[PDB]
Amino acid sequence: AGSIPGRRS
Amino acid sequence: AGSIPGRRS
Amino acid sequence: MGSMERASLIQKAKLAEQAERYEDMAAFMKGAVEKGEELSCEERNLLSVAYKNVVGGQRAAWRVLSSIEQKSNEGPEVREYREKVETELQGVCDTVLGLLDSHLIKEAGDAESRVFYLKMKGDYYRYLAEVATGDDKKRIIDSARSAYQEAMDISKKEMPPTNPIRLGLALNFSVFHYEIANSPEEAISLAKTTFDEAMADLHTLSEDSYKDSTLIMQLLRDNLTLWT
Amino acid sequence: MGSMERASLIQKAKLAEQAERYEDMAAFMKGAVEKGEELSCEERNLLSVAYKNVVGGQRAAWRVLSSIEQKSNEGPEVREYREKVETELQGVCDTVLGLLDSHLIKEAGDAESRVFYLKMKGDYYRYLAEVATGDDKKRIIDSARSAYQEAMDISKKEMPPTNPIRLGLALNFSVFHYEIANSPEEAISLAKTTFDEAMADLHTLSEDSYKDSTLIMQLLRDNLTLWT
Ligand SMILES: *Cc1ccc(C(=O)N2CCOCC2)cc1
Ligand SMILES: *Cc1ccc(C(=O)N2CCOCC2)cc1
Ligand SMILES: [Cl-]
Ligand SMILES: [Cl-]
Ligand SMILES: [Cl-]
Ligand SMILES: [Cl-]
Ligand SMILES: [Mg+2]
Ligand SMILES: [Mg+2]
């Protein structure tokens, strides 16, 4: 189950 | 040009 | 970071992201927050990206060590080292929650900023809940739920169904339901209703907004595929 | 790490490697070295793997920032942040070199341990040379050269041409020649002679030793392909 990756910005 | 990876042991 | 200019902290946070130095990124953004000014949309993303990467590495390490520890219970070193990583993770979560509480959330009046910070609050309580086992796991879970719920209520009143923050909030709240709250039916229902209402709003969007929204809708779909 | 048992430090270094927590790994292995006992073959590998990963991430970040800095020279933030990363990298290299000097190398009597530590010494001076620009780049380069050369002299007298430590030493010394010493012909000659003499010794090896040696010979071949 994946949450928002949110690793790149 | 690659040296010894040496990242896993 | 009290002696560094706010603008320099922001600039160095961007450099640290390019260098994949996420611990530095987080320290720079912590310093920028502590300057006391509100954060712009871009600056909020920098704060979030920094700490998500830091705690993401800690969570991954904690899961490796927790798994080894569980296999051994079928010396004290594995428990001790899992405890060390767990304490470090809790400290980072507490730091982020402290920034939100002092004083990002109370000064956030626009829907875009307030929903963003409350989603953040739900996420970092969720990370605390993942490792919680004592007399306060229930209170930590309710703290996560309450933050997510307030963010949901605002996002449904103030944002279109395709808004990427609204969609990512619903995605993570559904993961909370499934993984933390033992409510898989609520998780599936939320992801389905979120996806369907976004699909019906896509016709209003530009090509670039369409790409932003459909990317997050695919993440909702991926979870539904895993859960059903 | 003075209050932790040597065996616990070693055990936790292995756990940290599994968790990809290389900074912790290095701190645990630093503590193990400072117990004052010699290191076993496996323990030497743990020490080397830990610090290679730590400095490897620092070198990658330094190169990102150095490149941005060079594009800007065609505020002080990019230089300042590159300087911060560079200082942190130098500190880690100095720490490793300090461990080798106090007192790993002087107590290393067997060829396998002595060549291993001297290769390490050459490597960490090479990393210092990569960022050196002042009145001591030449001295740093000669320190790297001297360590590699002593290791080469021992390995040629005491180890078979297929020994993986001897092969990896020759590989890294050839990279030193090519990248640091501005001697590409010496680099190519060393890699070629190393490869050819290993190929002629492969018939003596077991299936598992054959796999170990041919893997490093392919790395020599990859460099020769890039250099010729
Ligand atoms: C909570 C959150 C964070 C980021 C985003 C977003 O817009 N992303 C861009 C595309 O990939 C996912 C991240 C939405 C929600
Ligand atoms: C300096 C050095 C380090 C490690 C090795 C080695 O045996 N490896 C196994 C296979 O992949 C490369 C590392 C040789 C030399
Ligand atoms: Cl520990
Ligand atoms: Cl405000
Ligand atoms: Cl800096
Ligand atoms: Cl000895
Ligand atoms: Mg100012
Ligand atoms: Mg003891």
> What Å distances lie between residue B2 and B5, D93, D122, D209, D226, CA to CA?
8, 19, 16, 22, 10
Chain C neighbours, 3+ Cβ pairs < 8 A: A, D
Closest C-alpha among C134, C142, C139 to residue C176: C142
Q: How far is D63 from chain B (nearest CA, A)?
A: 15
Per the listing, tokens 């092969």 go with D167
CB contact under 8 A, A4 and C53: no
Cα-Cα-Cα-Cα dihedral sign, residues D82, D84, D87, D91:
negative
Q: How far is D68 from chain B (nearest CA, A)?
A: 22
Q: How far is B2 from chain D (nearest CA, A)?
A: 7
Please, what's the b/e burial string for D213-228 (b: 16 or more CB within 10 A of its CB; e: otherwise)?
bbebbebbeebeeeee
> What Å distances lie between residue C13 and B8, C10, C91, C96, D55, CA to CA?
30, 5, 21, 16, 21
CB contact under 8 A, C64 and D11: no
**Calpha distance D17→D68 (Å, rounded):** 32
Residues 28-67 of D with CB under 8 A from C: 57, 60-61, 64-65
Find the closest chain C residue to D18 by CA distance.
C64
Question: Residue C224 Cα, ligand 6 centroid: separation in angstroms?
Answer: 61
Q: Which ligand is nearest to the CA of D3?
A: 8
CA angle C119/C1/D24 to nearest 5° reads 75
CA C219 to ligand 1: nearest atom:
12
Residue D71: other Cβ atoms inside 10 A: 9
Q: Secondary structure of chain B: what % helix, strand, coil (to 5)?
A: 0, 0, 100
Closest C-alpha among C39, C92, C37 to residue C61: C92
Closest C-alpha among C153, C143, C166, C158 to residue C94: C143
Q: CB–CB of C39/C47 below 8 Å?
A: yes
Chain A neighbours, 3+ Cβ pairs < 8 A: C
Resolution, angstroms, 1 dp: 1.8
**Calpha distance C54→C31 (Å, rounded):** 16
**Calpha distance C133→C164 (Å, rounded):** 33
Per the listing, tokens 């927050």 go with C33
Q: Which long-range contacts (CB under 8 A, 24 or more apart) does C73-79 make?
A: C75/D8, C75/D11, C77/D8, C77/D11, C77/D12, C77/D15, C78/D15
**Calpha distance C20→C53 (Å, rounded):** 9
D119 C-beta closer than 6 A to ligand 2: yes
CA angle D46/D174/D127 to nearest 5° reads 55
Q: C205 in helix, strand or coil?
A: coil
Q: How far is A9 from chain C (nearest CA, A)?
A: 6
Q: CB–CB of C65/C78 below 8 Å?
A: yes
Burial grade of C116 (CB within 10 A; 0-12, 13-18, 19 or more)? buried
Residue list, ligand 1 pocket, CB within 6 Å: A 4-6; C 119, 164-165, 168, 212, 215-216
Closest C-alpha among C122, C119, C165 to residue A9: C165
Q: CB–CB of D194/D207 below 8 Å?
A: no
Q: CB–CB of D89/D55 below 8 Å?
A: yes
What stretch of H or E contains D157? Answer: helix D137-158
Per the listing, tokens 């490796």 go with C64
The dotted CATH code for D6-227 is 1.20.190.20
CA contacts within 13 A on the Cβ side of D84: 13
Judged by a CB distance cut-off of 8 A, whether residue D23 touches chain C is no
Residue D103, preceding peptide bond in cis (omega within 30° of 0): yes
**Calpha distance D12→D28 (Å, rounded):** 7
**Calpha distance C206→C133 (Å, rounded):** 46
Method of elucidation: X-ray
**Partner residue facing D68 (CB), from C15, C68, C81:** C15
Question: Which residues from chain B sit within 8 angstroms of residue D17, using beta carbons?
Answer: 9
Judged by a CB distance cut-off of 8 A, whether residue C14 touches chain D is no
Ligand 2 site-directed mutation target among D216, D217, D223, most atoms within 8 Å of CB: D216
**Partner residue facing D48 (CB), from B2, B3, B6:** B6
Question: Residue D34 Cα, ligand 8 centroid: separation in angstroms?
Answer: 12
Judged by a CB distance cut-off of 8 A, whether residue C207 touches chain D is no
Residue C21 identity: R
Find the closest chain C residue to A4 by CA distance.
C168
Q: CB–CB of D101/D34 below 8 Å?
A: no
Residue C103, preceding peptide bond in cis (omega within 30° of 0): yes
| The length of chain D, given as a count of residues | 228
Q: How far does Cα D217 stand from its chain's mean position?
A: 17
The tokens describing A2, both together, are: 């994946």
CB contact under 8 A, C168 and A6: yes
Question: Residue D36 Cα, ligand 6 centroid: separation in angstroms?
Answer: 11
Name the residue ranges covered by the structural domains of chain D. Answer: 6-227
Q: Whose CA is nearest to atom 13 of ligand 2?
A: B6
Residues with Cβ < 8 Å from C153, sequence gap 6 or more? none
Q: Whose CA is nearest to atom 1 of ligand 1?
A: C168
**Calpha distance C173→C175 (Å, rounded):** 5
CA contacts within 13 A on the Cβ side of C167: 27
B2 C-beta closer than 6 A to ligand 2: no
**Calpha distance C124→C158 (Å, rounded):** 24
